[PDB]
Ligand binder design. Structure first.
Ligand SMILES: C[C@H](CCC(=O)NCCC[N+](C)(C)C[C@H](O)CS(=O)(=O)O)[C@H]1CC[C@H]2[C@@H]3[C@H](O)C[C@@H]4C[C@H](O)CC[C@]4(C)[C@H]3C[C@H](O)[C@]12C
Ligand SMILES: [Zn+2]
Lengths: 102, 135, 69, 146, 334, 146
């Protein structure tokens, strides 16, 4: 049932303690990479958040998150996704309130 | 304590030629006649005008993973009472004449030539250093 | 040979403005620059769709093979 | 070839050797020490290139540079001579600035007493540190360059 | 600052600078309460085919994500397969099929199911995932025609095959689900083909739903775009005839002249398309400064007629949220 | 391709930066190019496809904001982290070199960043152009690395 092919942790690029990691995401492009970069970069514990599309022919996205020693990169990625969900919920609520107002 | 050099300079000219954010200023030391300074400064962050006095100091550390971590907010450093702090490497000590040497610093591509008697520039040791400038 | 259904650049449907454009130039005697503005074509990418269109369908239909010419 | 019709670029190699062997705790070398290190490295290389005449016997020292005794090893000898001349130029610059700072320029090897050099007549804080700043050629640097 | 400055030769301060690590203060940490307090939406116009609304105090990445999702990720219904019976037109079959696929259809995408591609063609199309449109046009010479007429609409009967000729054929339960909302093209005046006597078109189009990234015919927006709010700062007063010249450097409704002091002032910077004409003249140097607010976006979403633009924007926000949720729920494989 | 980076006509590089790569490198290394940490990190992920590990150096400007110069970006391009063994030192002139005001001043004190100096792996002066990243010159970065 769970999608094991969606997001992968590239072992050849990660760190021993999990502080630095690189994730490969399938069927994604700039429209999520840029938002994840902006949200994760707002985490005080993250010093390196950056995404790349290695080839336009491949629907693929590599995102690298390197942190300090307080939190791992997986926790940073999960927190960034949760904060992106919260941002979308806030935008949705404000938009529907303004549509219902007028 | 960590201050290798400290002197007050008077700016004689500003050359903004072919550039929109970085200006090459030339300054003469008021206290010492021999010391002169040629420095590249981001003019947008630190606006410099002609005939403006400014204090220049060179320090080894601002204290009173391997990637760089910012200092925590609320700590006390030498940068608190300065307006423009730069980080760079000394890569060249040369001689102009007797009793007069020139030191070259590069703060990631922005240059500084500091010329003066080797008695005053005895503390520069060809290493990484902070350049603190105050108006 | 016939007017495109959609503007190439943005995607606005300009295929339904051709007959109205021809009517505006023929009947109302408006200039070409005002007829385009009257049809809602503000972006220049849509304006060049029916300002540069060569209607070759009428010339090709002169040689119909299923009816004497 | 990495130079202007030369097998090696001397300036870039010297800068590379100085940078990759940089150490602020390493004591600098006097010019005669630099020349001695260069001679120790380059001696057996040009001493194995013995010059033979056309007959097949050794050539006397008084006529080593004659035209009729030119061999196929003259390029290597010229390269070694140029390398020694470059190292001697660096040592000469160091000796000249040592002379300019009111010190003894030991371009030539000193006498046999070897009781120490510049112990007290040279001011420690003022003029040792200056010549240490402007030129500090270590044994590791010259060995790596060679 | 948050003002993208506009100069005569370059554009300055274009990158967002709200994150810890930009300064020693370590501020602008992500707080959902601060974002909820600061974010604003202002609707300026809401028609059936066009919406104009300002998003205030939001980052550029999220607005660009909304734009990209509206363009290429919001599904809509367009013709995908065309089956031809006796296409006698001078227009080729491929061209006619492409034109029919390019028309917009007024179908709510929520009423259709995605088509499973790996299924065989015998059972790929069901009544829940396919809309069948029938076209049948024959052109005959008009007997009761004017003697000296040259118009093709009077010499012939069906010389123009339009988009409104695409009749809707219900299949199965679509006879009940599509009872109150029949399938019609959003632009019935689209000129699909031209005919002459003896020529005939007869075809059946199977229409499915897809995303705009696969093909541009599935994009539900004519254009979805944003522009930053312009900002004109008059640093020193501009008086007299020069003020009139200062009025001619901008669109007419942008900058006006006060009756009392006879000095120019900005009246409506929204109308100011940035043509930067005022920076050409040396007299207005060190008197006017132009910029754009970096966190003030003016979305102008024009729909293709399938559904309302506000629904498109809401679906884009929902799609971004669902992407984030799906990535959050997925396990990470080594 | 890796073993044929130099033409045998003169030994100069032939596989190097071309048009639209020299211009982008010049605009990155231009003196008024200052990047914050977000832009720096994005650029570093852009050159490595989100694979390589990058050790962020301390910024060139610290008090008003934290800004990195594009020369530091190219220093990271040459040497990403401490595990990388690439340490190259070179001094070279650009295509357009305007000499400094006084002849006693060295070449790095020139206008328009004419002289490029790389020590360790850090770029201390100059802009990257066809003379430093392109073909036809024996003082280029890629030639030194090779
Ligand atoms: C497509 C979607 C259902 C998906 C299954 C339905 C369910 C919730 C619906 C919105 C809400 O009603 C709020 C609002 C009411 C206005 O009147 C018209 C617009 C809004 C934005 C609606 C549009 C649309 O109708 C939505 C998103
Ligand atoms: Zn258009």
């Amino acid at each position: 049932e769970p999608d094991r092919e969606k997001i992968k942790l590239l072992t050849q690029a990660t760190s021993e303690d999990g502080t630095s990691a690189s994730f490969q995401i399938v069927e994604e492009d700039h429209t999520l990479g840029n938002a994840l970069r902006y949200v994760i970069m707002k985490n005080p514990d993250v010093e390196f958040c950056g995404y790349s599309i290695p080839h336009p022919s491949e629907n693929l996205l590599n995102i690298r998150i390197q942190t300090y020693g307080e939190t791992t990169a997986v926790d940073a990625l999960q927190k960034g996704l949760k904060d992106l969900m919260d941002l979308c919920d806030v935008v949705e609520s404000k938009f529907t309130e303004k549509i219902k107002s007028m | 304590s960590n201050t290798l050099f400290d002197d007050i300079f008077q700016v004689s000219e500003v050359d903004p030629g072919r550039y929109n954010k970085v200006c090459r200023i030339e300054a003469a030391s008021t206290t010492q006649d021999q010391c002169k300074l040629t420095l590249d400064i981001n003019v947008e962050l630190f606006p410099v005008a002609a005939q403006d006095s400014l204090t220049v100091t060179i320090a080894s550390s601002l204290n009173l993973t391997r990637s760089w971590r910012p200092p925590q907010a609320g700590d006390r450093s030498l940068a608190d009472d300065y307006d423009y702090v730069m980080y760079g490497t000394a890569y060249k000590f040369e001689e102009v004449s007797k009793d007069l040497i020139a030191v070259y610093y590069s703060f990631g591509g922005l240059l500084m030539r500091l010329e003066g008697n080797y008695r005053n520039l005895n503390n520069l040791k060809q290493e990484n250093a902070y350049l603190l400038i105050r108006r | 040979m016939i007017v495109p259904v959609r503007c190439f650049s943005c995607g606005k449907v300009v295929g339904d403005k051709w007959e109205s454009y021809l009517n505006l130039l023929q009947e109302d005697e408006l200039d070409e620059g005002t007829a385009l503005s009257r049809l809602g074509l503000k972006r220049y990418c849509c304006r060049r769709m029916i300002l540069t269109h060569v209607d070759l369908i009428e010339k090709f239909l002169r040689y119909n093979p299923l009816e004497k010419r | 070839m990495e130079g202007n019709a030369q097998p090696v670029n001397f300036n870039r190699s010297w800068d590379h050797a100085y940078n990759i062997t940089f150490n602020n705790q390493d004591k600098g070398l006097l010019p005669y020490a630099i020349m001695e290190t260069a001679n120790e490295i380059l001696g057996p290389l040009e001493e194995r290139l013995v010059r033979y005449d056309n007959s097949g016997c050794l050539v006397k020292r008084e006529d080593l540079n004659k035209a009729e005794y030119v061999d196929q090893y003259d390029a290597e000898r010229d390269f070694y001579h140029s390398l020694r001349e470059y190292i001697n130029g660096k040592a000469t610059a160091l000796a000249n600035l040592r002379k300019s700072r009111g010190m003894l320029g030991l371009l030539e090897p000193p006498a046999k007493e070897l009781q120490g050099i510049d112990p007290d007549e040279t001011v420690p804080d003022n003029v040792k540190t200056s010549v240490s700043q402007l030129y500090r050629i270590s044994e590791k640097s010259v060995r790596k360059f060679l | 600052s948050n003002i993208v400055g506009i100069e005569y030769n370059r554009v300055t301060n274009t990158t967002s600078t709200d994150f810890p690590g930009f300064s020693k203060d370590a501020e602008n940490e992500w707080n959902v309460e601060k974002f909820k307090k600061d974010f604003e939406v202002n609707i300026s116009s809401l028609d059936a085919r066009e919406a104009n609304f300002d998003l205030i105090n939001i980052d550029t990445s999220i607005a660009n994500a909304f734009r990209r999702i509206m363009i290429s990720e919001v599904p809509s219904v367009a013709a995908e397969y065309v089956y031809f019976f006796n296409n006698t037109s001078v227009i080729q079959d491929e061209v006619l099929a492409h034109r029919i696929g390019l028309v917009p259809l007024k179908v709510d995408p929520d009423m259709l199911t995605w088509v499973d591609s790996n299924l065989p063609d015998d059972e790929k199309f069901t009544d829940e995932n396919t809309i069948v449109l029938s076209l049948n046009v024959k052109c005959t010479r008009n007997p009761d025609a004017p003697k000296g007429s040259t118009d093709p609409k009077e010499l012939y009967n069906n010389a123009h095959v339009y988009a409104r000729d695409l009749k809707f054929e219900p299949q199965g339960r679509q006879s009940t689900t599509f009872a109150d909302c029949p399938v019609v093209p959003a632009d019935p005046d689209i000129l699909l083909a031209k005919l002459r006597p003896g020529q005939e078109i007869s075809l059946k189009a199977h229409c499915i739903l897809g995303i705009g990234g696969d093909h541009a015919k599935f994009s539900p927006v004519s254009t979805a775009s944003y522009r930053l709010l312009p900002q004109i700062n008059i640093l020193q007063p501009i008086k007299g005839e020069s003020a009139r010249r200062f009025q001619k450097c901008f669109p007419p409704g942008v900058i006006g002249i006060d009756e009392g002091s006879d000095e120019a002032y900005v009246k409506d910077a929204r109308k100011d398309t940035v043509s930067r004409e005022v920076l050409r003249y040396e007299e207005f140097a060190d008197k006017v400064k132009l910029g754009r607010v970096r966190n003030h976006f003016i979305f102008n979403v024009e729909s293709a007629g399938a559904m309302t633009p506000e629904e498109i924007f809401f679906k884009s926000v929902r799609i971004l949220k669902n992407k984030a949720e799906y990535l959050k729920n997925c396990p990470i494989t080594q | 391709v890796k073993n044929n980076l130099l033409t045998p006509k003169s030994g100069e590089p032939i596989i190097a930066a071309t048009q639209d790569f020299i211009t982008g490198s010049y605009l990155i290394s231009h003196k008024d190019s200052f990047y914050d940490r977000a832009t720096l990190t994005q650029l570093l992920s852009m050159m490595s496809d989100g694979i390589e590990h990058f050790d962020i150096p301390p910024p060139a400007i610290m008090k008003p904001y934290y800004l990195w110069t594009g020369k530091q970006v190219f220093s990271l391009l040459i040497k990403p982290n401490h595990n990388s063994p690439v340490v190259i030192n070179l001094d070279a002139k650009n295509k357009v070199f305007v000499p400094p005001k006084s002849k006693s001043l060295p070449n790095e004190m020139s206008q328009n960043d004419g002289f490029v100096i790389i020590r360790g792996s850090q770029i201390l002066s100059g802009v990257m152009d066809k003379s430093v990243l392109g073909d036809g010159k024996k003082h280029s970065v890629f030639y030194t690395i090779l």
